[PDB]
Structure 1
Amino acid sequence: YYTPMMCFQRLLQEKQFDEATQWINYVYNPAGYIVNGEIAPWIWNCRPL
């Protein structure tokens, strides 16, 4: 949870966007998640939340 947003926040601070969105999709993705060629049933890409 902390390191993904560390990298994401730094990327946003350097005006990089597409790699930053790709990065933060590790924790949340409005389009859901793809696992094993299929749409995920969970909602957030981080279990403890």
Structure 2
Amino acid sequence: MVFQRLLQEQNFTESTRWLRYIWNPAGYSVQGEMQDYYWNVRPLEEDT
């Protein structure tokens, strides 16, 4: 919802951040190291 609202108000550099909070195709940097996933939500990783 926050990302959709920031897209409608065209704050692009924050909308892409709020999309990075759920999906990043470039992986995630956790404690300096990369991760093995791309979806930040575990019921989106495993289809619950």
TM range (shorter): 0.7 to 0.9
Aligned partners of 1:43 and 1:11: how far apart in 2?
22
- Whose Rg is larger? 2
Q: How do 1:23-34 and structure 2 match up within 5 A?
A: 23-34=18-29
* Aligned residue among 6, 10, 31 for 1:36: 31
Question: Which ranges in structure 1 are unaligned for 5 or more consecutive residues?
Answer: 1-5
Q: When the two structures are aligned, how many residues end up with a matched partner?
A: 44
Question: Which ranges in structure 2 are unaligned for 5 or more consecutive residues?
Answer: none
Shift of 1:43: 2.3
Q: Which runs of 4+ in 1 moved over 2 A?
A: none
- Residue identity over aligned pairs, in percent, reads 59
TM (norm. structure 1) is 0.81
Q: CA RMSD in A?
A: 0.8
Higher strand share: 2
Q: How do 1:1-49 and structure 2 match up within 5 A?
A: 6-49=1-44
